[PDB]
Amino acid sequence: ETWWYNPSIVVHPHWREFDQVPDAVYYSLGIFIGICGIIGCGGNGIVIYLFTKTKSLQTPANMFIINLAFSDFTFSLVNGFPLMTISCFLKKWIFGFAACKVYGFIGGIFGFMSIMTMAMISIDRYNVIGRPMAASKKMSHRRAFIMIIFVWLWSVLWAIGPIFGWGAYTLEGVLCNCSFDYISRDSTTRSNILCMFILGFFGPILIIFFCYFNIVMSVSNHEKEMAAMAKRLNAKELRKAQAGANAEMRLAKISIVIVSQFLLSWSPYAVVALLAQFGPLEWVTPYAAQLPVMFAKASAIHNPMIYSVSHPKFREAISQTFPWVLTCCQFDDKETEDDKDAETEIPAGE
Ligand SMILES: CCCCCCCCCCCCCCCCCCCCCC
Ligand SMILES: *C/C=C(C)/C=C/C=C(C)/C=C/C1=C(C)CCCC1(C)C
Ligand SMILES: CCCCCCCCO[C@@H]1O[C@H](CO)[C@@H](O)[C@H](O)[C@H]1O
């Protein structure tokens, strides 16, 4: 007697009043997310593969990048094909309630994980760039490792709530994927939602700003200091130190872009969410929630691409392993020069 009938999950009444979006929409959605899965898993596999095998990229900090890639790989995997894609092509979620929970639970856990991982990357950047050259700190495997343990502890904490009643993962949009329940306005769900948002999200965002705004408010602190030591009897060997800071600033610059990618990726959705939980639910329509979530899912597939066009060592690696990828973004040795000077160690001060 209806088109949203799911014998496994109880569809919130809100999604039931609307009319079924057109077949083309379902087919496109599936095809769309199915490509997020391919590019997402491919691109992140490529970054994990290269970052773990290439000795040039073998630095403690990079572990965070590995962690971010494993996070996005999984997101793209579980969230694209087959769970959602297949659902779409049938215009129905057919994998049951447990699959739904797992689906939504994985979705949030790694979403939180990627920003909190980016947080750690923002903190690393602050050590080697935000502080002065005199006290610059490089990430140590020990530090890094504990840091990713925080990331995993954390992420799971703010996404597991619904698994235990404190909130709930269920069907949303055109009913072919799952997420957290942002409609149901009771106490339990509202605190979890406020929690997910404030701790899972606003949380690492502060870390991010505090670190970058701290790296900008030290650009000059370093600009002056670079000269003080410059004329401080520092020979041609000064050039070395200079390329290194250029090197790091390049990675620091990268950080912000992948983070920017994230925000611009999740904010839309986050917003439509809160509207439904606090504002005009008549606003939160099929496409009002759907499309902005799609855009949110594809987020886990941009990092690999940002690296492929802005990471020298990594781009070097691709050129040497899957060069057919860097076609439209051809690699050149000159892109690795700054790392040469920075690493080349002057013997006995020459
Ligand atoms: C399940 C059936 C899939 C049919 C796909 C037909 C598509 C042709 C695609 C060729 C795909 C190569 C994908 C692996 C490469 C990962 C791309 C990610 C971009 C990474 C940039 C560093
Ligand atoms: C297909 C999408 C799924 C399974 C999404 C689940 C998402 C969450 C539990 C989202 C949490 C958030 C972030 C990771 C960042 C932005 C803000 C939130 C609170 C919406
Ligand atoms: C894009 C996210 C940036 C991740 C920061 C990785 C930090 C690795 O930065 C690396 O530090 C090494 C010394 O520890 C330097 O020798 C490398 O040139 C530099 O790329």
Topology record:
Elements (H helix, E strand, L loop, with lengths): L12 H5 L5 H31 L8 H18 L3 H8 L5 H35 L10 H20 L8 E3 L6 E3 L6 H30 L2 H12 L7 H41 L7 H12 L5 H8 L1 H10 L15 H7 L7
Antiparallel strand pairs: 1-2
The site of docosane has 9 residues, from helix 2 and helix 11.
Q: Can you give a write-up of this model?
A:
It is classed as signaling protein. Keywords: Animals, Decapodiformes, Inositol 1, 4, 5-Trisphosphate, Light, Models, Chemical, Photochemistry, Protein Conformation, Rhodopsin, signaling protein. The assembly is monomeric. The entry is titled "Crystal structure of the lumi intermediate of squid rhodopsin". The protein has 350 residues and is mostly helical. The chain is built from 13 helices and two strands. A two-stranded antiparallel sheet has the order 1-2. Strand 1 and strand 2 (178-180) form a beta hairpin. Helix 2 packs antiparallel against helix 3, helix 5 (96-130) packs antiparallel against helix 6 and helix 5 runs parallel beside helix 7. It is elongated. Docosane (TWT) is lined by residues 38-39, 42-43, 46, 304-305, 308, 325.
Q: What general form does the structure show?
A: elongated
For the termini, the CA-CA separation is 85 Å
CATH architecture grouping: Up-down Bundle
- Beta-strand share of residues: under 5%
CATH fold-type name: Rhopdopsin 7-helix transmembrane proteins
**Class in CATH?**
Mainly Alpha
Succession of helices and strands: HHHHHHEEHHHHHHH
Helical segment count = 13
Main location: membrane
Extracellular side: 1-25, 90-101, 165-191, 276-285
Disulfide bonds: 100-178
Protein name: Rhodopsin
